[PDB]
Amino acid sequence: GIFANCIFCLKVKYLPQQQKKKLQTDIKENGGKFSQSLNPQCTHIILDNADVLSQYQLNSIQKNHVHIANPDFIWKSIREKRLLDVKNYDPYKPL
């Protein structure tokens, strides 16, 4: 699946529960893994709009080369049936 070898930390506390679960099932059904809390094994952290990261979290992210993405990264990669450019979906560095 398109998310093989990807490990996602989900910070999507403010999404409707239905959307959170669809995010999870979309990830799991397409080869992806989950990490409850942020750790060095994470390749990705998904952040909804209302969620923020601390300086400590941002430092860990930089150190461990974690990709910060919004839920659209998942939705649109699924929709296009192809892993998209995660750099186009970074809330902490919009383009």
Author numbering: 4 to 98
Sentences from the study reporting this entry:
pmcPARP4 is an ADP-ribosyltransferase (ART) that uses NAD+ as substrate to add ADP-ribose onto target proteins, a process called mono(ADP-ribosylation) or MARylation. PARP4 is also referred to as vault PARP since it can localize to the vault particle, a cytoplasmic ribonucleoprotein complex. PARP4 has a distinct domain composition relative to other PARP enzymes; however, the N-terminal region of PARP4 is homologous to a collection of domains found in PARP1, a regulator of multiple nuclear processes including the cellular response to DNA damage. Collectively, the study establishes the human PARP4 BRCT as a nucleic acid–binding module.
However, the location of Phe39 on the potential nucleic acid–binding surface was intriguing so we also considered Phe39 as a possibly important residue. Conservation analysis using ConSurf indicated that Phe39 is conserved in 77% of 150 PARP4 homologs. We mutated Phe39 to glutamine and to alanine to test the importance of this region. We determined X-ray structures of the four PARP4 BRCT domain mutants. As expected from thermal stability analysis, the overall BRCT fold was not affected by the different mutations, and superposition of the mutant structures with WT BRCT yielded RMSD values between 0.5 and 0.8 Å (comparing all 763–788 atoms). Mutants F39A and F39Q both led to a shift in the position of the sidechain of K23, which impacted the charge distribution at the structure surface beyond just the F39 location. The loop that bears residue F39 was repositioned in the F39Q mutant, whereas this loop did not change in the F39A mutant, thus leading to visible changes in the electrostatic surface potential. Relative to WT BRCT (0.5 ± 0.2 μM), mutants F39Q and F39A exhibited slightly weakened binding, with estimated KD values of 0.9 ± 0.5 μM and 0.6 ± 0.1 μM, respectively. Relative to WT BRCT (KD of 19 ± 4 μM), F39Q and F39A showed weakened binding with KD values of 35 ± 10 μM and 33 ± 2 μM, respectively. The TM of WT BRCT was measured as 51.6 °C ± 0.2 deg, whereas TM values of 54.7 °C ± 0.4 deg, 54.3 °C ± 1 deg, 58 °C ± 1 deg, and 60.0 °C ± 0.7 deg were obtained for BRCT mutants F39A, F39Q, K31Q, and K23/24Q, respectively.
